[PDB]
Amino acid sequence: PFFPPLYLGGPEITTENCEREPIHIPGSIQPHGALLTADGHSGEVLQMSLNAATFLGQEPTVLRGQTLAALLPEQWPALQAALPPGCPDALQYRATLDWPGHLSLTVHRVGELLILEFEPTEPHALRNAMFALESAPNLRALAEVATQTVRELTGFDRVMLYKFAPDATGEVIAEARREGLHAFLGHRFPASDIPAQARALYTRHLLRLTADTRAAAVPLDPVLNPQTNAPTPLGGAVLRATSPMHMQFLRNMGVGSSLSVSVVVGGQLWGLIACHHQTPYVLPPDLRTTLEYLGRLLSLQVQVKEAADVAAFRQSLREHHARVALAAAHSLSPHDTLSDPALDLLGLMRAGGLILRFEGRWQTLGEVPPAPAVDALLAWLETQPGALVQTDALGQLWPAGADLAPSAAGLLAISVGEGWSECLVWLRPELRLEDLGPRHSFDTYLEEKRGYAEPWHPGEIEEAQDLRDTLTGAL
């Protein structure tokens, strides 16, 4: 449930309440440009940023209450045609203006209200890059080209590709940075660090920046909309003031400027091309457009490459599965055959541990909890219904196995025969990796993942239940 903004008696945005901050309505913009609001039908200017007077070369009451018909005689008709009444806030029209200098007009309609962003403005890298992304072999190499290309175009100090995991937590899957900067490659950060409110907004509008992290915001006058005495939804405005709670996060990293392009796959915020500069840095509108193209070109290509990887992954697993089933038919001893490192039942499910259980007894393979602990676990496994069991934290699902986290935090089991006398049981180790900020957010991520293992890829869980069925036939 949202809070009111700071300008409507709303509360302090602390670190404990920040998931409720109304970030779509700061009623203020960044000072590198200027903002007007106007009535959708009449084109009557209603609101205005304080600096807008100066950005344009007209006096602060002369602009207010004026028509866009008069102000933008050439643009106003074509503008209005480009944005129908009732069309979505996602739809943006851009044109350039020739003024006393060159200005980049960016427009979008939030129903009744038109919003107008002004910024100052004036070869084949993108085309070559598009083809590079397409002819990349896998998601990792795709991500590398993405971060690399974005850095070559912008000249940012750091360009990460931040990938969201199923549990809303993030990971830097790729990085392209300046020589002599500390690497975030591989680091992971919690759900908390990018709130749901921001995620949801980043799914609608696929670009936002923070041109200077220490610059003061420029409020709107009036702050509230004369139409509806309601706060002006700047959610889909580039110039929107960035959250002060997040600006602080960036300042504590020594980030002078920020930028992030949303990578959206099938109406789902898959990730961000996240960018940092160590000094303030305003990307030109003409160049940001290039990023937005990549943002969508990547949004396609992620999906194509990622699904093609998952395909080739399970294809490895079918071959591995069928090589087990080969030796499982020609079986001298059920335990001997599966313990065999040539078969590698650990490597099929990529596991730190494994319990083979057959003929009224059990063996281990690899790193596994102590002798009595396994007996307790196998005793517990019989309690479960169905042929297949699964978890990313057996410590939770089974409280008495909290102590067994280090050797076996994550679990994937299957019963060979029905009932758990004869069964295979994969086990994975507890996960581990290498005040406000990323030092703390990395630590607090690992704190969120206490007694948590790497989760099981669905292809592994499916192939497990295939192997479950195959090994019943080995009897």
Ligand X SMILES: *C/C=C1/C(=C/c2[nH]c(/C=C3[NH+]=C(/C=C4\NC(=O)C(C=C)=C4C)C(C)=C\3CCC(=O)O)c(CCC(=O)O)c2C)NC(=O)[C@H]1C
Q: What are 231's two structure tokens?
A: 């706060």
Q: Does 91 bind its own copies (CB under 8 A)?
A: yes
Q: What is the DSSP letter of 240?
A: B
Q: Which two tokens stand for residue 431?
A: 């996960």
Instruction: Please give the C-alpha separations between residue 401 and each of 372, 379, 406, in angstroms, as whole numbers.
Output: 12, 12, 11
Residue appearing with tokens 């499982």: 328
Partner in contact with 232, chosen from its own copies, ligand X, none, beta carbon below 5 to 8 Å by kind: none
Q: How far is the CB of 14 from its own copies (least distance, A)?
A: 36
Q: Does 96 bind its own copies (CB under 8 A)?
A: yes
Angle at 352 between CA 350 and CA 356, to 5 degrees: 90
Q: Which stretch binds its own copies (CB under 8 A): 58-66, 119-127, 152-160, 373-381?
A: 119-127
Is 162 or 358 the residue whose CB approaches ligand X more closely? 162
Residue 361 makes contact with its own copies by CB under 8 A: no
Please identify, among the stretches 39-47, 187-195, 355-363, 413-421, the one whose residues bind ligand X according to the rule CB under 6 A. 187-195
Instruction: Tell me the C-alpha distance between 130 and 132, whole Å.
Output: 5
Residues of this chain, 209-238, that bind ligand X according to CB under 6 A = 210
Element holding 459 (H helix, E strand): helix 458-472
Q: Residue 289 touches which of its own copies, ligand X, none (CB < 5 to 8 A by kind)? A: its own copies
Is residue 199 classed exposed, middle or buried when 0-12, 13-18 and 19+ CB atoms within 10 A define those classes?
Answer: middle
Options 94-102, 178-186, 211-219, 373-381: segment touching its own copies (CB under 8 A): 94-102
352 neighbors 427 (Cβ within 8 angstroms):
yes
* DSSP summary character for residue 265: S
Per CB under 8 A, 127 contacts its own copies: yes
Told to check if 244 binds ligand X by CB under 6 A, we report: no
Residue whose Cβ sits closest to ligand X? 18
Alpha-carbon separation of residue 3 from 9, 152, 180, 436 (angstroms): 10, 40, 41, 21
Using CB under 8 A as the binding rule, whether residue 266 contacts its own copies is answered as yes
4 contact choice in ligand X, its own copies, none (CB below 5 to 8 Å, kind-dependent): none
DSSP lists the bridge partners of residue 207 as: 261
Which parts of 432-471 interact with ligand X (CB under 6 A)? 436, 438, 441
Is 433 among the residues that bind its own copies (CB under 8 A)? no
List residues forming the annotated binding site for a tetrapyrrole: 18
Which DSSP category does 182 fall into?
-
Write out the residues near its own copies by the rule CB under 8 A. 82, 87-88, 90-96, 123-124, 127-128, 130-132, 134-135, 266-267, 289, 292-293, 296-297, 299-300, 304, 307
